[PDB]
A paper describes a structure:
As proof of principle, we chose to crystallize the SH3 domain of human nebulin by incorporating it as the guest protein within a BCL6 BTB-domain lattice via its genetic fusion to the NCoR1BBD1 sequence; the nebulin SH3 domain structure has previously been solved by NMR, thereby providing solution-state information to enable the determination of potential artefactual conformations induced by the scaffold, and it has a largest dimension of ∼28 Å. We expressed the nebulin SH3 domain as a fusion protein in which the NCoR1BBD1 sequence was tethered to its C-terminus; a linker of three glycine residues was inserted between the two sequences to reduce potential steric clashes of the SH3 domain with the scaffold [Fig. 3(a)]. The structure of the nebulin SH3 domain was resolved to 1.56 Å resolution. The versatility of the BTB-domain crystal contacts thus allowed the incorporation of the guest nebulin protein even though it drove a change in lattice organization. The hydrophobic patch of the BTB domain provided a site for interaction either with the NCoR1BBD2 appendage or with a co-crystallized SH3 domain that was recruited via genetic fusion to a natural NCoR1 corepressor BBD1 sequence; from this perspective, the BTB domain served as a chaperone for the SH3 domain and provided an interaction site to facilitate the 3D ordering of the crystal. Although unexpected, the propensity of the HP to interact with a variety of hydrophobic sequences confers versatility upon the organization of BTB-domain lattices, thereby offering advantages over strategies that involve the recruitment of guest proteins into precisely defined scaffolds.
Here, we report the functionalization of the BTB (bric à-brac, tramtrack and broad complex) domain from the transcriptional repressor BCL6 to serve as a promiscuous assembly block that may assist the crystallization of a guest protein. The 129-residue BCL6 BTB domain forms a symmetrical strand-exchanged homodimer that contains two lateral grooves that bind corepressors with high affinity. We showed that these can mediate the formation of a variety of highly porous lattices, and that a guest protein may be incorporated into a BTB-domain lattice by its genetic fusion to a corepressor peptide that binds to the lateral groove of the BTB domain with high affinity. We have shown that the surface of the BCL6 BTB domain contains versatile interaction interfaces with the potential to mediate diverse lattices in a range of crystallization conditions.
Residue numbers in the entry:
A (entry chain D): -1 to 80
B (entry chain C): 5 to 80
C (entry chain B): -7 to 0, 6 to 127
D (entry chain A): 0 to 128
Amino acid sequence: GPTAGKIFRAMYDYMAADADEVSFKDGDAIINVQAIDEGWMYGTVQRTGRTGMLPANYVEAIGGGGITTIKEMGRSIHEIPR
Amino acid sequence: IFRAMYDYMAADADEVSFKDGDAIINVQAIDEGWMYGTVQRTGRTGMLPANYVEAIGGGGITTIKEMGRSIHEIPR
Amino acid sequence: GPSSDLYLDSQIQFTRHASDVLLNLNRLRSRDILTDVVIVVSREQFRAHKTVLMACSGLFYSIFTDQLKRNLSVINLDPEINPEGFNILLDFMYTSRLNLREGNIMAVMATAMYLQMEHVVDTCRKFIKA
Amino acid sequence: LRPGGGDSQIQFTRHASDVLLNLNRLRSRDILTDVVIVVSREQFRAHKTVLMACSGLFYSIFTDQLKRNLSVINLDPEINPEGFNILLDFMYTSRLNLREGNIMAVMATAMYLQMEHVVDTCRKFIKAS
Ligand code: NA
């Protein structure tokens, strides 16, 4: 069945420093990530379709299960007698 | 006011139907078997059997629910 | 083996926990357990927990965080304070219920003003004009 | 609206939660805390009244005539401090913060503290029945 996943999103603007890097803007989806290693990742900026190397410290991961709140309405603790 | 003690289904259009626990208001005795009043939940007014309702005694205290903050907040 | 029946971060919020705690604090007060202060109001004495008093009252918060009164297990209120009004407010602190029998609203409001319990004062203002 | 005569009771529906929040604020600021609980390498400041309100074990300790005035209590050596911290936070916030990696420790600590309703809630969380 479907599972909780995680995606990657740029946090800051970046201009590529070489032909193997890609430029992106704050908020860009970074998709089909092939690897993350030592401050660099290889991925596709979805808005432009360009694929290459990105500085990993410019992108954040979003997703997973989060923290789910469950409500319990029963008595929580012992009652001290009167 | 009066409170219904049982469910009742109107037998004709001049009777009212109601459920156990309904409040019946503006009540009037027609005879010692029958009353005329309004079912507050539905707004319907008509005849109902007297033995199906009980008068609620007066003089109770009033309970008021206050949902706002009750006390000062101690800062962190 | 049999089925484990185990579900392969959660926050469980106990919606009546705070009211259960406060009830038990009032049960402790009724049995005089861990009470650490007596409040003296004219000829009348009321034992309580400092932490509950300071949670509810600006006046008691100032008293129990005043370094000069750190050692005090007896607190004397101003002689103008009505002990019946104080008892009503103390019961409110420990129960969430403010008892307003006929004719008592001004004494309760005045007690709440002295105790610097402004949300209670505001509720009394609404009450008295309705 | 109300009659000009007669008696009234105002019920403050969020008072208890407002009190508990203020008790937690006093704890966070170390105001009127009167006990330290030691759990392996870790120490936790608290108010005895809140502990007694929430735990059968602490209720028994602090109503014992010859233990009421202890100010430092070591728990048994198997007690896990992460579990204890989670339970202490619950006492002061009504929120029991669980992970699959620490739910067993929370449950074991709640059993030790005699917090049976919390144990019961943990049982339901872990296992269908
Ligand atoms: Na600690």
